Amino acid sequence: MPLIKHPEVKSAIEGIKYIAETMKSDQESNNAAEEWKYVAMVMDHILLAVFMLVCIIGTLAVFAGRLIELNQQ
Amino acid sequence: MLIKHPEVKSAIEGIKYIAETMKSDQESNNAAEEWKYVAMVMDHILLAVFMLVCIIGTLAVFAGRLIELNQQ
Amino acid sequence: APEIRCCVDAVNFVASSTRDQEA
């Protein structure tokens, strides 16, 4: 992560400026949204690794002692 | 079912590009909507087909014995 | 003339935004 100033031309010019500033603010807000999205993706990756590790650890440690004891006796 | 500044020429080309972009989007949407129409037609046919089969199979399962019991 | 330059820059900006979204 010539001078043709007229009440309808000025509206068009001002509205074109408004359109540009509108998509400027939209781009800024969108980028601020992708920042949080990147954050959520990073926690997704970290917790994927953590949860697979805990799944392996729970599949092992619950059954480890009684399996090695049966291997020995 | 004569004002040849680069900025002005770039603005002209950008407006043209905007129009061609929206045209291409409309052209893609038309064929997407054609496929949607085909799927909608298939759903209208299959609704009637499935309700008909729902009635017909139930009747075929049960009437063969219910009519025999009515005759008995 | 400055008023024309400002709207020219605005039009260029809204063209570049569309090019960004198409990439």
Side-chain angles (χ1 to χ4, degrees), chain A residues 40-60:
Chain A
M41 188 219 51
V42 157
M43 325 159 39
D44 257 346
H45 284 154
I46 293 160
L47 282 141
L48 165 76
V50 160
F51 267 68
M52 299 297 201
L53 255 54
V54 177
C55 165
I56 292 163
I57 282 161
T59 324
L60 253 58

Side-chain angles (χ1 to χ4, degrees), chain B residues 7-8 10-11 13-15 17-18 21 25, chain C residues 5 7-9 11-12 14-15 18-19 22:
Chain B
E7 299 183 5
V8 188
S10 313
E13 198 180 4
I15 273 280
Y17 169 74
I18 285 268
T21 288
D25 293 326
Chain C
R5 194 181 169 85
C7 61
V8 157
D9 292 344
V11 166
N12 275 335
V14 311
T18 301
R19 296 177 182 296
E22 306 250 322

Side-chain angles (χ1 to χ4, degrees), chain A:
Chain A
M1 184 53 213
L3 259 64
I4 44 170
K5 298 292 180 65
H6 180 265
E8 280 85 304
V9 195
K10 290 146 37 196
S11 178
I13 299 307
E14 282 147 20
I16 277 156
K17 297 173 185 179
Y18 164 75
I19 286 178
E21 307 166 17
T22 292
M23 53 183 81
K24 184 156 306 143
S25 298
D26 287 338
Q27 278 187 323
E28 285 148 16
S29 295
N30 276 341
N31 289 329
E34 330 161 328
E35 296 205 73
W36 276 117
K37 282 175 181 133
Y38 181 71
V39 167
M41 188 219 51
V42 157
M43 325 159 39
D44 257 346
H45 284 154
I46 293 160
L47 282 141
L48 165 76
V50 160
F51 267 68
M52 299 297 201
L53 255 54
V54 177
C55 165
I56 292 163
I57 282 161
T59 324
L60 253 58
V62 172
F63 299 90
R66 191 50 175 177
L67 270 38
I68 67 178
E69 188 129 309
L70 281 154
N71 219 37
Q72 296 152 2
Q73 64 180 20

Side-chain angles (χ1 to χ4, degrees), chain B residues 11-66:
Chain B
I12 274 165
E13 198 180 4
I15 273 280
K16 261 176 95 205
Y17 169 74
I18 285 268
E20 302 332 317
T21 288
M22 269 156 84
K23 199 150 176 1
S24 75
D25 293 326
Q26 180 204 30
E27 296 174 14
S28 66
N29 283 4
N30 290 324
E33 221 82 352
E34 289 223 329
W35 273 119
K36 289 166 163 63
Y37 184 84
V38 163
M40 191 255 302
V41 162
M42 277 165 35
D43 251 356
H44 269 122
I45 285 150
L46 278 144
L47 164 74
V49 162
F50 267 71
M51 300 315 288
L52 221 71
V53 170
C54 169
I55 290 149
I56 276 163
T58 306
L59 279 174
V61 155
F62 288 114
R65 194 40 202 213
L66 285 206

